[PDB]
C-alpha cells in the first residue's frame, strides 16, 4: 500500500483549494523512483468545471481522498504483477487540477478554481527530496491519459528543477501512456484543439520552453500534442499508445461501413506515422484506454514482446540490443488485429 501525504506547502492546491498530495511507498535500498501522474480528462470553463465538481469531485479536491491506495500494474511491488520495477520507490500523484498537469494559477478573488498541476509536480518532487529522492539514480515520471500528456509537458521541467536544486546525478526520464493525441478532423462534427486553447487561458497553462519558443504566443496549445512537443524534449521519453485509443475516438465522435472503416484505418496509420521516429515506444493495434497501472498490463505484446520487457530493454539501452527491443509499433491496420489486445 501507498500512504497519503498532503503537501506541506498548503498553497499548492487542488481545484477547490484543498491541499494537493501524493501517495508513497518507499523501497529502502532502491535508488529508482517512479512518480505516476493520474489522468481523467480536464475542464476548461466555469460551467463544465462546476459540473465536474459535482460528480467527479475526487478529481478536483483532496477532501475525500483515502489514507492509502494499493499500487497496481507498474506501481505494484510484486514482481509477478510488475516484472519491470517492482522494487522501486512508488509514488502516485492524484490528478486534482483538471488542467492536463499544465496549470500554474491559484484560487483568488478572480478565480473560482485553482489550476496548479505543473506546480503540484514541482512541489511533490521538492518534498520527496527530503524523503530519499535526493539519493535517486533514476526518476521515472510516468502517467496515463491526461497524466501521460502531463509527462510530456513536465518531464523537462522536473529535470531542470533537479539541476537547479543541485542534483545533477538524478536521471529524469518520462513514460507517457495514452497521452499521445492527434489534432485530427472528427469523423462527424468542443474538439481537443479548441478545448486546450480555452483551457490554457483558463488555467494559465504552461508548456515546455523549447516547444513554446517554436509555436509562440497564442499557439501554445500545439505543445499538448505528443508528436509536436516530443521532438523538443531533452529527457528520454518512452511512449505507450494504443493505435485506436478510446479517448481519441471519443473526441473524434466515433462510437461498420466504408466511410468509418476508412476513417479508423487512417487514424491508425497516422498514429503509426507519428511514432516512426520515436525510438522507445509501445503501440499496439487495439481499441482500449490506458494500460500501465492495470493489474494485467503484463499481458499485451507487440511482435512477441511485452511492455514490462520493452521498458526493461529501455533501461538497458540507457546504461540496438540483441533480443531486447525498445521500438514496438504494430503495423496491422484494424483494432484487435493483435491477438493480445485487452478483452
Ligand atoms: C481520459 O481521457 C483523457 O484524460 C484525455 C483526453 C484527451 C486529452 S487527455 C488530450 C490531451 C492533450 C491533447 C489532446 C487531448 O485530447 C483528448
Ligand atoms: C509554496 O508554493 C508556492 C507556489 O508553488 C511557492 O510560490 C512558494 O514559494 C512555496 N513556499 C514554500 C515555503 O515552499
Swiss-Prot record:
Protein's name according to its UniProt entry: Palmitoleoyl-protein carboxylesterase NOTUM
Q: Which family does it belong to?
A: Belongs to the pectinacetylesterase family. Notum subfamily.
Query: Tissue range of expression?
Result: Rarely expressed in adult normal tissues.
Residues annotated as the enzyme's active site: 145, 245, 289
In alphabetical order, the GO MF annotations are: palmitoleyl hydrolase activity; phospholipase C activity; protein-containing complex destabilizing activity
Query: Which catalytic reaction applies to this protein?
Result: [Wnt protein]-O-(9Z)-hexadecenoyl-L-serine + H2O = [Wnt protein]-L-serine + (9Z)-hexadecenoate + H(+)
- Residues bearing glycans: 9
Q: What class of enzyme is it?
A: hydrolase
Induction conditions: Up-regulated in hepatocellular carcinoma (HCC) with high intracellular beta-catenin.
Amino acid at each position: 500500500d501507498l500512504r497519503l501525504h498532503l503537501l506541506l506547502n498548503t498553497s499548492v492546491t487542488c481545484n477547490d483549494g484543498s491541499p494537493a498530495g501524493y501517495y508513497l511507498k518507499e523501497s529502502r535500498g532502491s535508488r529508482r523512483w517512479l512518480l505516476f501522474l493520474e489522468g481523467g480528462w480536464y475542464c476548461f470553463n466555469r460551467e463544465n468545471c462546476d459540473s465536474r465538481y459535482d460528480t467527479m469531485r475526487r478529481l478536483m479536491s483532496s477532501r475525500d481522498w483515502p489514507r492509502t491506495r494499493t499500487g497496481t500494474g507498474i506501481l505494484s511491488s510484486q514482481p509477478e504483477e510488475n516484472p519491470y520495477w517492482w522494487n522501486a520507490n512508488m509514488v502516485f500523484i492524484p490528478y486534482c487540477s483538471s488542467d492536463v498537469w499544465s496549470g500554474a494559477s491559484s484560487k483568488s478573488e478572480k478565480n473560482e478554481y485553482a489550476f496548479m498541476g505543473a506546480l503540484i509536480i514541482q512541489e511533490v518532487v521538492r518534498e520527496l527530496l527530503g524523503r530519499g529522492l535526493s539519493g535517486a539514480k533514476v526518476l521515472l515520471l510516468a502517467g496515463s491519459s491526461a497524466g501521460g500528456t502531463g509527462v510530456l509537458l513536465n518531464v523537462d521541467r522536473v529535470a531542470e528543477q533537479l539541476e537547479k536544486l543541485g542534483y545533477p546525478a538524478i536521471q529524469v526520464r518520462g513514460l507517457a501512456d495514452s497521452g499521445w493525441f492527434l489534432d485530427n478532423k472528427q469523423y462527424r462534427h468542443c474538439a481537443p484543439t479548441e478545448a486546450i486553447r480555452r483551457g490554457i487561458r483558463y488555467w494559465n497553462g504552461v508548456v515546455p520552453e523549447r516547444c513554446r519558443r517554436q509555436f509562440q504566443e497564442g499557439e501554445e496549445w500545439n505543445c499538448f500534442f505528443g508528436y509536436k512537443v516530443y521532438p523538443t524534449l531533452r529527457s528520454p521519453v518512452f511512449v505507450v499508445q494504443w493505435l485506436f485509443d478510446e479517448a481519441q475516438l471519443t473526441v473524434d465522435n466515433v462510437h461498420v461501413q466504408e466511410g468509418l472503416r476508412l476513417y479508423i484505418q487512417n487514424l491508425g496509420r497516422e498514429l503509426r506515422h507519428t511514432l516512426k521516429d520515436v525510438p522507445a515506444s509501445f503501440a499496439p493495434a487495439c481499441l482500449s484506454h490506458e494500460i500501465i497501472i492495470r493489474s494485467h498490463w503484463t499481458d499485451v505484446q507487440v511482435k512477441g514482446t511485452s511492455l514490462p520487457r520493452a521498458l526493461h530493454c529501455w533501461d538497458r539501452s540507457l546504461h540496438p540490443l540483441k533480443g531486447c527491443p525498445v521500438h514496438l509499433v504494430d503495423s496491422c491496420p484494424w483494432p484487435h488485429c493483435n491477438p493480445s489486445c485487452p478483452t
